[PDB]
Design an enzyme around this catalytic site. Structure first.
Site, PDB file in Angstrom:
ATOM      1  N   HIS A 299       0.535  -1.332   0.412  1.00 29.99           N
ATOM      2  CA  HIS A 299      -0.370  -0.160   0.072  1.00 29.99           C
ATOM      3  C   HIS A 299       0.600   1.181   0.794  1.00 29.99           C
ATOM      4  O   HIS A 299       1.861   1.191  -0.166  1.00 29.99           O
ATOM      5  CB  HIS A 299      -1.206   0.098   0.937  1.00 29.99           C
ATOM      6  CG  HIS A 299      -0.356   0.156   2.197  1.00 29.99           C
ATOM      7  ND1 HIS A 299       0.724  -0.605   2.853  1.00 29.99           N
ATOM      8  CD2 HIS A 299      -0.578   0.685   3.356  1.00 29.99           C
ATOM      9  CE1 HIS A 299       1.152  -0.584   3.883  1.00 29.99           C
ATOM     10  NE2 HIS A 299       0.421   0.257   4.138  1.00 29.99           N
TER      11      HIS A 299
ATOM     12  N   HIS B 281       1.755   4.080   2.230  1.00 32.85           N
ATOM     13  CA  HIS B 281       2.442   4.258   3.462  1.00 32.85           C
ATOM     14  C   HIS B 281       3.555   4.107   3.487  1.00 32.85           C
ATOM     15  O   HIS B 281       3.396   3.077   2.948  1.00 32.85           O
ATOM     16  CB  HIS B 281       1.571   3.927   4.699  1.00 32.85           C
ATOM     17  CG  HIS B 281       0.425   4.098   4.784  1.00 32.85           C
ATOM     18  ND1 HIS B 281      -0.984   3.667   5.797  1.00 32.85           N
ATOM     19  CD2 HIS B 281      -0.088   5.338   4.933  1.00 32.85           C
ATOM     20  CE1 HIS B 281      -1.917   4.681   5.946  1.00 32.85           C
ATOM     21  NE2 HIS B 281      -1.652   5.654   5.407  1.00 32.85           N
TER      22      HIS B 281
ATOM     23  N   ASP C 141       5.659   2.927   4.826  1.00 38.02           N
ATOM     24  CA  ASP C 141       6.710   1.668   6.127  1.00 38.02           C
ATOM     25  C   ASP C 141       6.391   0.107   4.626  1.00 38.02           C
ATOM     26  O   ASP C 141       6.390  -0.579   4.732  1.00 38.02           O
ATOM     27  CB  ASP C 141       6.188   1.001   7.199  1.00 38.02           C
ATOM     28  CG  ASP C 141       4.226   0.765   6.707  1.00 38.02           C
ATOM     29  OD1 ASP C 141       3.618   1.629   6.237  1.00 38.02           O
ATOM     30  OD2 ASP C 141       3.068  -0.035   7.529  1.00 38.02           O
TER      31      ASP C 141
ATOM     32  N   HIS D 292      -7.509  -1.743   5.542  1.00 37.91           N
ATOM     33  CA  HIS D 292      -6.697  -0.611   6.087  1.00 37.91           C
ATOM     34  C   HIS D 292      -5.893   0.648   5.382  1.00 37.91           C
ATOM     35  O   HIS D 292      -6.492   1.998   6.211  1.00 37.91           O
ATOM     36  CB  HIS D 292      -5.291  -1.033   6.630  1.00 37.91           C
ATOM     37  CG  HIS D 292      -4.232  -0.276   6.590  1.00 37.91           C
ATOM     38  ND1 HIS D 292      -3.905   0.537   8.115  1.00 37.91           N
ATOM     39  CD2 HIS D 292      -2.945  -0.023   6.229  1.00 37.91           C
ATOM     40  CE1 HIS D 292      -2.892   1.281   7.850  1.00 37.91           C
ATOM     41  NE2 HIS D 292      -2.329   0.826   6.953  1.00 37.91           N
TER      42      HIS D 292
ATOM     43  N   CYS E 198      -0.088  -4.576   6.536  1.00 41.23           N
ATOM     44  CA  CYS E 198      -0.983  -4.209   7.191  1.00 41.23           C
ATOM     45  C   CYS E 198      -2.625  -4.037   6.939  1.00 41.23           C
ATOM     46  O   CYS E 198      -3.156  -3.563   8.291  1.00 41.23           O
ATOM     47  CB  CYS E 198      -0.757  -2.395   6.898  1.00 41.23           C
ATOM     48  SG  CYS E 198       0.825  -1.700   7.213  1.00 41.23           S
TER      49      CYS E 198
ATOM     50  N   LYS F 160      -4.321  -7.168  10.886  1.00 43.10           N
ATOM     51  CA  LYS F 160      -4.149  -6.793  12.907  1.00 43.10           C
ATOM     52  C   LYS F 160      -5.309  -7.576  13.680  1.00 43.10           C
ATOM     53  O   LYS F 160      -6.360  -7.368  14.061  1.00 43.10           O
ATOM     54  CB  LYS F 160      -5.147  -4.936  12.224  1.00 43.10           C
ATOM     55  CG  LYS F 160      -4.423  -4.341  11.755  1.00 43.10           C
ATOM     56  CD  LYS F 160      -3.508  -3.664  11.850  1.00 43.10           C
ATOM     57  CE  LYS F 160      -2.430  -2.846  10.701  1.00 43.10           C
ATOM     58  NZ  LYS F 160      -2.103  -1.890  11.409  1.00 43.10           N
TER      59      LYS F 160
ATOM     60  N   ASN G 214      -4.029   2.714  13.138  1.00 45.18           N
ATOM     61  CA  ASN G 214      -4.172   3.520  12.142  1.00 45.18           C
ATOM     62  C   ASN G 214      -5.331   3.690  11.485  1.00 45.18           C
ATOM     63  O   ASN G 214      -5.582   2.976  10.526  1.00 45.18           O
ATOM     64  CB  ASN G 214      -2.590   4.470  12.055  1.00 45.18           C
ATOM     65  CG  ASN G 214      -3.013   6.688  11.651  1.00 45.18           C
ATOM     66  OD1 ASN G 214      -3.810   6.422  12.231  1.00 45.18           O
ATOM     67  ND2 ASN G 214      -1.619   6.617  11.467  1.00 45.18           N
TER      68      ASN G 214
ATOM     69  N   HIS H  53       2.328  -5.672  11.005  1.00 43.08           N
ATOM     70  CA  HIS H  53       2.813  -4.790  12.351  1.00 43.08           C
ATOM     71  C   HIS H  53       2.519  -6.138  13.351  1.00 43.08           C
ATOM     72  O   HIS H  53       3.263  -5.154  14.737  1.00 43.08           O
ATOM     73  CB  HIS H  53       2.048  -3.846  13.050  1.00 43.08           C
ATOM     74  CG  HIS H  53       2.104  -2.463  11.899  1.00 43.08           C
ATOM     75  ND1 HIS H  53       3.758  -2.171  11.622  1.00 43.08           N
ATOM     76  CD2 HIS H  53       1.445  -2.154  10.831  1.00 43.08           C
ATOM     77  CE1 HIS H  53       3.925  -1.267  10.373  1.00 43.08           C
ATOM     78  NE2 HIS H  53       2.408  -0.754  10.307  1.00 43.08           N
TER      79      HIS H  53
END
Ligand SMILES: [Zn+2]
Ligand SMILES: [Zn+2]
Ligand SMILES: [Zn+2]
Length: 227
Positions: free
Chosen positions: A81, A83, A85, A143, A162, A165, A171, A201
């Protein structure tokens, strides 16, 4: 590690299955602390694919160097994605003429964010990054709007990014809680056979991580009716 000062934890490269390595990098992320970010390095006959990049250009050269130093040509990178990270090392890999892949949506979201885009892009629910060997899948918004997973068919491994989860959704500013249960449903629908599920994560778990994420996705839809 080998430096001169305090310590954000060094990049980790741990062998998961026969041709599958996990990589962990760490970043200060305000409102949370050190956050770990898990990605994969998939191997084919002397060629390496980065599934997601490290947080920074610095760890991305690190990760690439380790595998180049063990006899592997880095053949590409897929970002799960937009983001940072997952995308934070795309510029480094682009300046080194290593193909960077991202979904068309990821690249436009990278664009709106003023960030460097991946050089190749794919459109559609599916995309074989290497046919019969690495598969990209779009379960739907969750996400982020663009989040994808990466499936290895001969290992039954599922990089969830991400999107997975298990113990809390994290977030939520760029998230779609109303659509996330449907995507988590359709995700388990397709990959129930996941022997291993590597989330971004949280640590590697198993097929239940699909079940755990589903039931956390629906829990955030519940909390929507607060006033
Ligand atoms: Zn994210
Ligand atoms: Zn993330
Ligand atoms: Zn870890």
């Amino acid at each position: 590690g080998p430096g001169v000062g305090e310590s954000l934890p060094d990049l980790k490269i741990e062998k998961l299955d026969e041709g599958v390595y996990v990589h962990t990098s760490f970043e200060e992320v305000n409102g949370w602390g050190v956050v770990p970010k898990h990605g994969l390095v998939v191997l084919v006959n002397a060629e390496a694919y980065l599934i997601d990049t490290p947080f920074t250009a610095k760890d991305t050269e690190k990760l690439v160097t380790w595998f180049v130093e063990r006899g592997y040509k880095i053949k590409g990178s897929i970002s799960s994605h937009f983001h940072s990270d997952s995308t934070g090392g795309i510029e480094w890999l682009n300046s080194r003429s290593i193909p960077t892949y991202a979904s068309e949506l990821t690249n436009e979201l990278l664009k709106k964010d003023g960030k460097v885009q991946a050089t190749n892009s794919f459109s559609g629910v599916n995309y074989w990054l290497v046919k019969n060997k690495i598969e990209v899948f779009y379960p739907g918004p969750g996400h982020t709007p663009d989040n994808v997973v990466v499936w290895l068919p001969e290992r039954k491994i599922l990089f969830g990014g991400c999107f997975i989860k298990p113990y809390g959704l994290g977030n939520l500013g760029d998230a779609n809680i109303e659509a996330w249960p449907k995507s988590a449903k359709l995700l388990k629908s397709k990959y129930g056979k996941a022997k291993l599920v590597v989330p971004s994560h949280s640590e590697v778990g198993d097929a239940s991580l699909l079940k755990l994420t589903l039931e956390q996705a629906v829990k955030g839809l519940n909390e929507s009716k607060k006033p």
